[PDB]
Symmetry: D2
Subunit: 70 residues, 4 copies
């Protein structure tokens, strides 16, 4: 009751989607880490409240730069 | 030599980006699985060669539907 | 003020971690989808409440099978 | 021909697995970035060849520290 044909279809389909998305995941991982190190160095938080809070603000800014498609 | 202030900045920033991307990851995970079950049921592969090969073709089609932004 | 040497270090490091994790992401993606189709077919939810609720319960069961390391 | 009941089961199941994996994805994202900045600062690559190559070596070391389960 376990389709050995749909299974190898999905495995191959999942693997190829993984491979196809490599350049995007790498690109956006690089840029996220750069973005967060840049925005920290250009205006470092000091206290816990400001560090957590700035973390949240720059998460939103990174998102807006990712809902804009570049 | 380990910045306890940049660390909590990044942790908060990573967590909030995780939360912000929830709806996208869920949406595209749902659709991927639906897309692959739909395209299998509407034209099932039979053999290993065709199952692997159709898996690769529909991976590309899913990608094209994801580089088009809807 | 942008280290062109740490950058290519990270890009290469991110790409190779992506490649190394391929078999795990594929394996656990396959099994998640199988697990969820199996547990649905062996006891299908009917209503919205039960569908959402069973979705949550089997998410926890999948997790327990993933905190056990097999 | 589109099961509106299995769909909401999967959506809920995918969302809850996303939520459950939050602490792991955050933890391992934090540590990856720290690990890679630490290993760069404690022995920086200089040239392209060494930067790409060290990137690959520390990807493997991060992996071994992740196949060991801590």
């Amino acid at each position: 009751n376990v389709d050995p044909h749909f299974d190898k279809f999905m495995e191959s389909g999942i693997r190829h989607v993984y491979m196809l998305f490599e350049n995007k995941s790498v690109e956006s991982s690089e840029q996220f880490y750069s973005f967060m190190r840049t925005t920290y160095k250009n205006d470092p938080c000091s206290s816990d409240f400001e560090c957590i809070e700035r973390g949240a603000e720059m998460a939103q800014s990174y998102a807006r730069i990712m809902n804009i498609k570049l």
